[model samples]
Target chain A: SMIAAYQARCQARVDAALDALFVAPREELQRLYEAMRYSVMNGGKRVRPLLAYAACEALGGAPQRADAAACAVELIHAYSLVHDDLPAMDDDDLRRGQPTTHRAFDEATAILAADGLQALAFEVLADTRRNPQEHAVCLEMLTRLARAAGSAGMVGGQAIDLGSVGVALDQAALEVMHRHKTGALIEASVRLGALASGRAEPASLAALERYAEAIGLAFQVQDDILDVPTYPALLGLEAAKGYALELRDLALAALDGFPPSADPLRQLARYIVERR
Target chain B: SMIAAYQARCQARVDAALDALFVAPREELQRLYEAMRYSVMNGGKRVRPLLAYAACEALGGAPQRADAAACAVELIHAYSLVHDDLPAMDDDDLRRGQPTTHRAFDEATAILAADGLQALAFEVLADTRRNPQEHAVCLEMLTRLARAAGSAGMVGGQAIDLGSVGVALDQAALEVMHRHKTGALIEASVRLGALASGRAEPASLAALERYAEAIGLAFQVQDDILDVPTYPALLGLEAAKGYALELRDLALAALDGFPPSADPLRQLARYIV
Candidate 1:
């Protein structure tokens, strides 16, 4: 119940921030703005933003400190989903039980919306008005998010995924693909929350890094297990669940010595492994 | 001749910086890297970088100060061209007298490459190692570039252009479209150079803004005169050139009080017309 309540609060804050950040004023830009809003505002579990808030709160940081980072990660996630659903990419018509951006609007508008969102993410992060004293930290966050979401991280993984369609891959090869495709942003999400706090101890950051890595891998393992025939096929259902459990434990173990405020993070690790 | 040499030097500096910035070490990203490299390293004239360097120099700032902004602007230009050449957009197969990125590589690669380059542009601008003392200034540059290149500027103009196909647009509408589509980035390019200098006085910046606005419109006028059925069709060749000439005069007039070091800016105004 605590986890659920905490997640709801985080979601509300991130949603408000995102809405304000993406206000589409000009008549000419309205269509692109609408497409972006449609993609981001679609009802979905705001897991990434929650991860950011929990990490920030765990280290005694205010939730607003992480708001920009939280919204930024979600924006990157939203943009990726829009682009992935394009005719050139995955070509999926449905996402979160609604028409994809391209399906709702034309392809050009969808592409521009995604492009605009990506630019806005960095722009939002670099905004000195919000935290003028943290200019250096903000710059650092910008570089980290850019690298995570750029070719080296999400895009690189997407390229690999695109190349590996229908081609059988071994477990090691698969792990590499998943690490880049999904793990990088997940890792960055937790790291950004800590960085946004600007008061996280070095030791605490190390623990968070370990925690983030474990959950990042576990998150992907769970996804593969949920799919029809992937990790569960290669490693039996029991074996797949075993891998996720192992990762979940590793994540929980990293929370040692963290304050009681870190219970939400502990709950998140369990949720990642237990979510159906 | 002086302007030609000044332009050539700026191009070399920007080209080198871009090549270093977009280098792809990972094997998986090689194709994407090649596409980005091909799009950037082509023989096209580096007018954006030239504007950046000229602005910085006119303000008596170090050339290196403007290097990243120069390269970033060109990268945005490079990515825009790559995306514009896609089948869903302009559908062109040639750029800079050569096969476009989509023609050289597949459409998917071209799209991803453009996406990567755009990200790289912002990433390179926010790089603290390059401008550690200028975080706030760098932030301004990033915001300006993103706004200029995003829906409000380049992308919004593009949306208008895509919608206005085969339709007669009034001069006001056409100017608004072109201002967003091309003029926004061009104007940003000049302003970025001045901002990158970190030494520009407000008076000089205001003058540069006037110069950039004039040249921005003139650049479009020249483009229309060169094209088949656009601004030139409505305004005629002489009229289009005439408008460009008027813009050129405004651009030159903006530099009236500047030191002789502003010669390149003056030369660029002539070149814009």
Candidate 2:
């Protein structure tokens, strides 16, 4: 078990960061600020940021060093949720146990909120908080975020998803489906976090790739196992559990050659699987 | 009268600059590129860019330096058309004698085209292709572009236009609507072009502001004269013409204190009236 005090301290740090980050001179960016504050501050696990902190901790880098990156990924994550819930898209009516942006607000409001959030994400990344000395890197991050969130990346993946529903998939097709669908953002988060720390060495990056790939697949395998909300249980829970275990082993084995300091990552994989 | 050769040469340069600026790679961006190309390359007077070049020429600046600024303004203008023709917006089926973007393509395609074109306009200002190394000035151009393109700007002004339809707007409301709907972008283009040439001192900016106020109102006056589709011709074509000429006087008076080079502006105003 982890120390309760440590978890509380970390959670509070994230909360404070969330509060301080979104509040600004609302006059210039009033519409965007309102949208961001409403969407960002309301609810989220801070998981993406936590992941950044975890990676930084594993590398013995400071958490504060990764804060801006953490927030950026989280902002992107929030925007994906906003877009994914739009009327032309998934048309979802709920998010994070509340009315989705489009539900509680008008469609125009929802669209504006998503757009403002998208721009704000880049704005923060390009601001002095993340060190404009890394302007090139920051611009690269902005371009990457825009691409990833745009039609070619997340939106393209979504287009494929929208087009591919109910179509039978072979293993390769399934790989492509999940790779772009869920894995793109996960991989980007890892890369962005590494880039922020300025600690993403080639060898370490390659190893994190291995780690992220295994966990990414393992986490999906577990979701495939759970298959909640009338998910196809024809495979049966036991059979799904078997595939999940196999994926977990693959994840653990991939981390075997990593330095001992990378144990938290390996342990986090286990925690994900072992969580009730 | 101004030399027709000067007009032809300036328009040709603006067209060429527009062509060189928009080279997209594939797929949706390509579609957007084509839609933008079709929208602007069709027959219109290139009025906004003409003003930019006119302002540049008035300042003794080269017309070549203002070509990109002209293209930027045109892109913003084209994007407004795409958005304005949306099913939710003005819902027009044609623009500039061709099918509107949504009528020519599907709704989503039109939306994406507008979005991409909007970004393209800013990218032009930010891109190093035709801009000076002064990023602060580029940023100023960008700020103006966004202000003119955004919700509280042209888009907001359109919303007001839609709301005010069939209602009498007296004068104050009319001024507010025109300020955002047309004058904002017109002023921005002139300022941006002058600033881009690196010659627009404070006095020059003020003079250009005076020029913009008159020409902007004059442009509307001509539209009122054309009494095209939806203009308020209930006031009678003759009365509308009279109104336009009054506006023309208001416009010409605004540029009176400028240097001798402002003669073309006087002639241009006269040509319109």
Candidate 3:
């Protein structure tokens, strides 16, 4: 019950930050901000922010310390979804049953707003210098975020995924694709929260990575099971559920070094696996 | 003549850095990097980097210190042109006699490559913390670059421009449009060089601002006069040329306080007009 409330609080926290950032200072920029609002403020589970905050708590940092990082990752996620829905890419006219940015706005506004959101993410991330972390730590965060978002990570995965348009990916190739497409940002969320704490030791971080890796795939597998295919279709139906359980257990075990302060991380692991 | 060599040097410096940065680690990402090279390495006069290097010299900083700023701004410029030439935007099949990125590559690859370049610009700028500047200075640079590249500036200008695709603009609307569209990044190139110096007094910066504000429009007007439109058509052709010269003089006069060290800046202003 408390963990669910914690999720609610994280969602509210980043939602407020996201709201404050996208406003237009003048009338001419209104429609741009409105499109951004429709895309970013549309309802969704803020699981990425939840993982960021939960990781911050695990590392003994105040949740506020993770605010900028949490907000930036969510913005990145929003921007990617907007672009992925473009007619040139996945051609997604609707996302989660709502009109995609392109469908709601024209293709031009969607492109520009998504571009602006991406710039906003870096701007948001750079502002974390106001936080207590040292300069290198901030630079590290920027480097990781850029690499994850760019050709080296998410975009490269997209290039492969879209490049194959009609081809079928075997389990191994599909796993590689999923890690880049979704897991890169998820892992960055975890790593960024750890860095935000400034108290994360190597052992603690090693543990967090193990946890992130397992649940990263577990979340995807659970998602694949939820509405998805590829995982359940290639593997047996029961086998997919068994793998999700196994991955969640692995994630839980990796947190062995943390005390009760990490309860939220554990909660998130289970939630990600079991979420409808 | 010496100024031309300096221009070539600045161009070579950033072109080398851009080349070093866009390689793919695996075969899966080849086409993306190829698109990046096709878009970024296409031959253009590196005028933005020249402005950065020239402003850095005027402010008494090493041009080396402005490397990341120069490179990042150029990347932003490249990315803008790539997206601008898309079917949804300006719909240009060719840029400077070469096929545009979208024309050379597919729309999807062009879109993703442009996005990657934007991210790479931030990544490049962030690495400038490796320079001698302070943390605040580095963050300030990031803040300025992002704003200049983002909705508040260039992209916003783009929206306004595309938003007005069916409309005709008077001189006033055209100036406002040009300022956000092209002037913002040019101004950033100037401001960033001054900030990179760390010795920029307010007076010196104010002077640089006047210089930038003038040449920013002056460059656009010259382009308007060159391939150009609205400026010549809205105003008389002779009136447009006279205005360009007037703006050029304003740009040069703003640099009067500096010594001959600003000769390159003066040269650029003349060149800009």
Candidate 4:
């Protein structure tokens, strides 16, 4: 119940942030913007944004401070999905059983929209609060987001996936793939939130990382728990479920040092395992 | 001859910078890296890098200071070209008489490579010089680039071009497309160069914008001078050439207030026409 309310609250704020971003470009740019909006606005669980918000609150940052990082990480995740659903990539026409970007718009528009969204993510980061004191924080967020979305993160993982089909892939291979493509962004989501606070220290950062890795793996393993020969298939569903429960406890354990403001992250770790 | 030498020198440095960026990743990423390398390294006259170098020099910023901006701008251009050549886009199989990224690799790798390259552009821009006072300049460069490369610039231009193919397109429509897709980055190249200097005055900034606009249009007009319909087709080759020359003169005139450092920009303006 607590995590649900937390998610809804953060999702609303981030959605409002996302909505304001699409300021209805000139007539020529309408369809393009529409595709951009459609890709992001399609209602999915705001996992990345939630991590950002929880992490921010965990570090005592105001919600407003986390908004830009929230939107930036979510945009990065959104654009990746849009591109991943391309005819050239996964070729999936439906996202969440509705028309994907390429399906709703033409292929070219989808491609351009994804490109626009990626730029928008950086642009959002670029338009930092300009606190001057927080300039390096802003810069670091940009660096992390770019690397996460780029080769070392999501895209590289996708490359690994494309080559993994019916090939020599094992537990190590899958672990690396999952870490890059999924875990990196998830970790960044948490770090971005903490960074948004502008008050995070070494122990707090490392603890968040510990929690991030636990839940990041927990989230994906649950997704695998939720299967291209996923964790369930490889480790057996019962074992996979056991590991998730273990991760959920470990995730909560890492946050023991955090204040009650950290409740959402605690609950979120639980939710990652138990959610369908 | 001087401009030629300048272009060659800057080209070599930028190329080196570009080459160094691709430190071999793990084995899984080899093909993607190859596509990225292929897209950028396919020598087609390093116009964006040249513009950054020339504009930086014009502002008396050292070439080393301009390196990041040069690589960033050129990477943006290179990535755009790779995606543009995608099978779902223009579907062109060749670029500069070499296989397009999609052709050389597959469509998926091409898409991923281009996406990676775009990220790399921002990553490069993000790695600013970190001079505390000059932080604002770094931030401004990031803002200008994201806009220029995003919906307001190259991507928007592509949307227009896709929409314009057999629609009620005219000269104005064509110009907007050219400005967005092509002219924006060209202008950004010069602006980024100047911004890299961190010593630019308002007057110098305004004048560089003047020169940037003039040469940006001239570059495109010369390119059309070099068309969907083409300036040659629309205005007649002779008339198109005349307009380029006119823009070139205006471009040169904008730099009248600068010292010898501005010569590269003046020469670049002449070269643009």
Q: Indicate which candidate wins on TM-score.
A: 4
Report clash pairs, candidate 3: none
Name the top lDDT candidate: 4
In terms of docking quality, model 3 is: medium
Q: Compute the DockQ of candidate 1.
A: 0.66
TM-score of chain A of each: 0.95, 0.83, 0.94, 0.94
Best by DockQ: 4
Off by over 4 Å in 4: A129-133, B129-133
Better of 3 and 4 by DockQ: 4
Q: What clash pairs does model 4 have?
A: B221-B225, B222-B226, B227-B230
Kept native contacts, as fractions per model, are 0.52, 0.00, 0.62, 0.61
* lDDT string, candidate 4, B114-216, tens digits: 8998888888888754222266677778888998999888899999899888775566777888888888898899998888886788898889888888888
Candidate 3 chain A weakest ten by summed lDDT: A127-136
Q: Is the docking of candidate 1 incorrect, acceptable, medium or high quality?
A: medium
Number of backbone clashes in candidate 3: 0
Residue range A1-276, candidate 2, lDDT tens digits: 432343344456566766675553323344444555677777465656666666666565666766666666677677667756765456788876788876775454455455444444544555555433254455444444444444444444554455454545455555555665566566666556656666667777666666666676667667665555111353467776776666667767766766675666666677556655
Query: On residues B1-273, what C-alpha lDDT tens digit does candidate 1 reach at each position?
Result: 789899889988888888787667577667777888988889768889998888988888877888888988998898888888888777899876789998998777787888888888888888877644377788888878888888788887888787677988989888888888888888888888988888867898889989988888888888777764376787888888898899999999998888777899898778765
Can you write out model 2's per-residue Cα lDDT over B1-273, one digit (the tens) per residue? Answer: 363555666678778877774454434245545655666676666777877777776666777777767877887777677766765556688875779877886555555455445545555655555654365555556556655655455554554566576887765567667776788788877777777766677887777777777677667757776755233544566776777677668757767666676666666767777
Deviating ranges (above 4 Å) for candidate 1: A130-133
